[PDB]
């Protein structure tokens, strides 16, 4: 019966909104994340949801991890963090019910929606700046509430829909969950002090957000092209930084390099990041820059 605290308030399993199992219907598989499969579902004009499932074959620790994940997501309240409709923990397999994000994960979206001869203007700079603003807004909410994400990366962000008017949200809190209670650490998203001293602060998430910005403006490339985890660790620790993505406007790259200052005190907080993203968004020289066309 672990307690969870956020924003000075303590909650437990009894605070989660249990939805009767008979009201929940699975429609289709949407793929898998940290735990088992995620399904499209509906709760009884039914409510459309994403259903995160816990494998019935799992450890005591897997169970406790799943519970902590439920508590974490249920206590956030922000438009750029996926909502939790509720849980179904009293039937097996256990479910967490979340806001359905019909556009899928941000990394996949960027790779699949790259401008190409068949879809020549599938995305523009403003689409990318809007995604960046959306995630920066969610990050600012976390920072204001003293929550350190620890894995701000494109794979962990989701889109409401594929089309125009999409909203990007933070959708996975697995790293924070593990720490609340190595070839799997997200080395390529971590600042020098994090992988050395294990020191984490909100300026950790600033650094990671810089890497996310690179992922966005590269249209979904893996950070540090051609470098392994240890090569990145040594590169970053020695002052090495990524080059601008193809066609990236200068003002946008400058946000990245500010996010990647060696000393955490020299990195901007998220209020400043949002200010800078807004300035880029209003600058015609930025938003009129054409994205590269991937040949196809």
Ligand X SMILES: COC(=O)[C@H]1CC[C@@H](n2c(NC(=O)c3ccccc3)nc3ccc(CN4CCCCC4)cc32)CC1
Contact residues for ligand X, defined by CB under 6 A: 30-33, 38, 50, 82, 98-102, 104-105, 158, 171-172
- CB 45 → ligand X: shortest distance, Å? 19
Two tokens, residue 80:
């750029």
- CB 103 → ligand X: shortest distance, Å? 7
52 is in an annotated binding site: yes
Q: What is the number of other CB atoms lying within 10 angstroms of the CB of residue 130?
A: 18
User: CA 141 to CA 170: how far, in whole Å?
Assistant: 11
Whether residue 150 contacts residue 179, with contact meaning beta carbons closer than 8 Å, is answered with: yes
- CB 52 → ligand X: shortest distance, Å? 6
**What do you get for the CA distance between the two ends of the chain, in Å?**
54
Nearer to ligand X, 16 or 286 (CB): 16
The one catalytic residue in 151, 178, 205, 266 is 151
Segment holding 165, helix H or strand E: none
**Residue 104 buriedness (CB in 10 A; 0-12 / 13-18 / 19+):** middle
Nearer to ligand X, 157 or 256 (CB): 157
285 is in an annotated binding site: no
Segment holding 53, helix H or strand E: strand 47-53
71 is in an annotated binding site: no
Residue nearest to ligand X (CB): 33
100 is in an annotated binding site: yes
* Catalytic (active site) residue 15: no
Whether residue 223 contacts residue 210, with contact meaning beta carbons closer than 8 Å, is answered with: no
- CB 154 → ligand X: shortest distance, Å? 10
Nearer to ligand X, 101 or 128 (CB): 101
Nearer to ligand X, 70 or 280 (CB): 70
The string over 163-192, giving b where at least 16 C-beta atoms fall within 10 Å of a residue's C-beta and e elsewhere, is: eeebbbbbbbbbbbbeeeeeeeebbbbbbb
Residues near 226 by beta carbon (within 8 Å), at least 6 away in sequence: none
Residues at the binding site for ATP are 32, 52, 99-101, 172
Residues at the binding site are 32, 52, 99-101, 172
* Catalytic residue list: 151
């Amino acid at each position: 019966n672990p307690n969870y605290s956020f924003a000075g308030k303590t909650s437990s399993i009894s605070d989660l909104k249990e939805v009767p199992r008979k009201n929940i219907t699975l429609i289709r598989g949407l793929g898998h994340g940290a735990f088992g499969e995620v399904y499209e579902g509906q709760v009884s004009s039914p409510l459309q949801v994403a259903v995160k499932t816990l494998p019935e074959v799992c450890s005591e620790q897997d169970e406790l991890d799943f519970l902590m994940e439920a508590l974490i997501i249920s206590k956030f309240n922000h438009q750029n963090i996926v909502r939790c409709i509720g849980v179904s923990l009293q039937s097996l397999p256990r479910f967490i019910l979340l806001e359905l994000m019909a556009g899928g994960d941000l990394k996949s979206f960027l790779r699949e929606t790259r401008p190409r001869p068949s879809q020549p203007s599938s995305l523009a700079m403003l689409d990318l700046l809007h995604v960046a603003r959306d995630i920066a807004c969610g990050c600012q909410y976390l920072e204001e509430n003293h929550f350190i994400h620890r894995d701000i990366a494109a794979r962990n962000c989701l889109l409401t829909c594929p089309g125009p008017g999409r909203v990007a949200k933070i959708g996975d809190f697995g790293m924070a969950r593990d720490i609340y209670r190595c070839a799997m650490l997200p080395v390529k998203w971590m600042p020098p002090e994090a992988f050395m001293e294990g020191i984490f602060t909100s300026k950790t998430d600033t650094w990671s957000f810089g890497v996310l910005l690179w992922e966005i403006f590269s249209l979904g490339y893996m950070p540090y092209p051609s470098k392994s985890n240890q090569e990145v660790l040594e590169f970053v620790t020695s002052g090495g930084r990524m080059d601008p993505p193809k066609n990236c406007p200068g003002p946008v790259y400058r946000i990245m390099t500010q996010c990647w200052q060696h000393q955490p005190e020299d990195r901007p907080n998220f209020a400043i990041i949002l200010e800078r993203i807004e300035y880029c968004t209003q600058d015609p020289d930025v938003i009129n820059t054409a994205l590269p066309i991937e040949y196809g």
